[PDB]
Subunit: 150 residues, 6 copies
């Protein structure tokens, strides 16, 4: 189904660095639709839940602190395989090991400031969407360029 | 004093031609700070309230009928003379008459499908901002690049 | 009418300099359709007729010589106001006086190597199309993105 | 010896998504010389003759039915291992699986609408070139950038 | 002559914003040749000599303090009419007044930190070029592209 | 440490093709800081010392002759893991083998003229950096962007 959605959030570093458009631009070009988008400064409460699975790791502290140290451009893209393609496009956890051509590969250098977050799977995509987005903020009627899909 | 704001909004034809990234990136490279942002489908009420000044104009008709036929990305940016600088970057009403390097100049071709809206005067920015944006959807502690202003 | 066509030809200098895609790219983005396109090395006979109105000027010699000293990517774009918009996008005769953002302004430096040629009016557009293009080489069925025109 | 050629062709979905410039520019920046080029609407004959190797495959069906539903930009480039290098730049069959930086990787999302075709082996280039191109539509006196080869 | 030269300098606010490459590439694109290039930190001496003409002018204070406040990438480009062309590409004194397409229009918003200085006349160029560069650093051998000048 | 340094050099074939700005901007984009920069023409001495390791290696002949055959833009970038990251961005020895996204994959097609050299290890970097640069040319003051490193 071409309804697969994912959740992306350009953190306070891709934001203060002037990358919001560049990043969105890359997904628009691939062929994915933007079904939600907004700017907000994440709450500790939202930071801790967003980052639930890292509750016990040394860096969870360093994480939530930063992800709410400024604005975050949260968004949702839809399309076939969107969840895995986005990751692929994002790169790997460490910017320095990210191949050139991927968001992290091209602009990233330090794991702590690795620019963007993208759902690792449909399940977390959905936990992430619902969580940041109230169903009203999303689109419903969606048909990207009929030259994308057969 | 470096806090001037304008409300821009990419219309259904910009948002659907996959130009939200490009457009945002342009003001972003210029140096203005994004202070609000959100996708949505405008309502006849807010749209007709937007085009108040064009009520009896023969085009107000299909004007309101287009900024509600799909998604709109609203936004507010901030910095020195952003209001005047934005329009300049947008171009002129007729995209065919806009200079290359401007937004309508580079991607527009018809007056109905002229891609983006801008605030023509502070008074008007402040007026369209409050329309589209609630007071708690816009940043406050701002800090543009420290290399940007003297 | 959205059938206005124009004739553009990237001369042997925009060609050997690696500009064909860049140049085409700019017209595709503005919103114009490509109704014909081909590579060929112009004939003296075609050069002299193409450049008919400069038959008596000192440079006509220097012109036709060069315009057939190599391959030329001849093309035809269609859309509203295509003839005048293209010129505007091309710049002025002298690259050095061409505003930045226009093809000549950005890549041009010497009038003799000013990169591209674009019809100055419908009348020469048509004399130029017919002349380089046999009606069979052009398209007929044409509808660009319905987000360009109202 | 530096004369290898491949026949690439931007399909109805690339040509219609306004990607002929971008695609051409990529091989152009790489260093290959364009040695032929032409837009056109392929015929069932030449198309089915193109996809000969896929005759009984369940997709040959709507395969031939798409490369004839609109315009196609055929082209031939030339240089060292262009044949192998082209494919690499194109990506892999599934656009979702193509790496960012490649053509299908950056703009594709479905296998039916995968944008561009390429020659997978010299023997196959030479085979598709002669199909689409008459012997008098391709350059002969070629001279790539003098800084390009040793 | 195709051997005119201008002295350009990406100011500290330019070097700090990651603009060196972009700025340099705009020029390499137009067709000018890099004859001189180097990063240094201007000594108060050089800044006073270089910005001499504005001594009695009030703002001399900032121009020099600011300009010595960090690294500078000094450049000397050669080319037919480079002096007047380069300043055109730069835009006007106020980045808010500069039009899109020019270095200051695309990137700057405040007069105090307007990214780049460029020689205003062939008078100031040779003056500034000698004051910031030494005969041995500047190339004597220039091979102007044949597809550039006639 | 965020103070590792690599020595990069755009070879003659790179300077001649108008690639300095692009190459430099790829690095400024990633997040590395330019610490050293200058254009010179390598003396046969420097080229032999610099390319020493390949003496017994056959192709020593070309590497040095070619590398002295024109201007060079010498660079020294600083950054966490710059050495290994920079070589990754460059691609592999053969530009035909390099993947899109890297300097050599996007731009080169022949091993002999592969545009840029980059230090292979922190061992070779400090060696090469001292041999091509002088303590006074290299910045001592570095202010690494806060949105870059944690
Ligand atoms: N080694 C670590 N040191 C510091 N921060 C880390 C480390 N590992 C992960 N993080 C950070 O928090 C996130 C960890 O999530 P995960 O490891 O799943 O990566 P990804 O973001 O690719 O899903 C990273 N994105 C990064 O900001
Ligand atoms: N003659 C016209 N026909 C159709 N649409 C028009 C016409 N004049 C203006 N409009 C449309 O309505 C909007 C009118 O606002 P205004 O004329 O102030 O433009 P701007 O966006 O430059 O402020 C335009 N953006 C355009 O889409
Ligand atoms: N002053 C001149 N010296 C040399 N070549 C010239 C001169 N004037 C015009 N040409 C050349 O031939 C063409 C002249 O046509 P025209 O003057 O109408 O310019 P355009 O190409 O803008 O229509 C130019 N494009 C340029 O290559
Ligand atoms: N499973 C499939 N379903 C739909 N279309 C397919 C499938 N396999 C291949 N095709 C289509 O037919 C072409 C088949 O050729 P091939 O598989 O050799 O691809 P490539 O373009 O990588 O050589 C593709 N480009 C694609 O559009
Ligand atoms: N009104 C001003 N306030 C502050 N600094 C200024 C002012 N006007 C000029 N400057 C600075 O002085 C610089 C050099 O001189 P000038 O203004 O004559 O030429 P240009 O502006 O083209 O460089 C400018 N580039 C700008 O950085
Ligand atoms: N097979 C070869 N034929 C010609 N020149 C070569 C060959 N292999 C290497 N070179 C040149 O020698 C250079 C420097 O050394 P090396 O190949 O060890 O590292 P790198 O290739 O990463 O620079 C290469 N960059 C390339 O320009």
């Amino acid at each position: 189904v071409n309804k697969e959605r994912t959740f992306l959030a350009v953190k306070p570093d891709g934001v203060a660095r002037g990358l919001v458009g560049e990043i969105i631009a890359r997904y628009e070009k691939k062929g994915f639709v933007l079904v939600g988008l907004k700017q907000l400064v994440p709450t500790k409460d939202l930071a801790e839940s967003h980052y639930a699975e890292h509750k016990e790791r040394p860096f969870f502290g360093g994480l939530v602190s930063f992800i709410t140290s400024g604005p975050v451009v949260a968004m949702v893209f839809e399309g076939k395989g969107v969840v895995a393609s986005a990751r692929l496009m994002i790169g790997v956890t460490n910017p320095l090991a990210s191949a050139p051509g991927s968001i992290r590969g091209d602009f990233g250098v330090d794991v702590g400031r690795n620019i963007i977050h993208g759902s690792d799977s449909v399940e977390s995509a959905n936990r992430e969407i619902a969580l940041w987005f109230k169903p009203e903020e999303l689109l419903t009627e969606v048909k990207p360029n009929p030259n994308l899909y057969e």
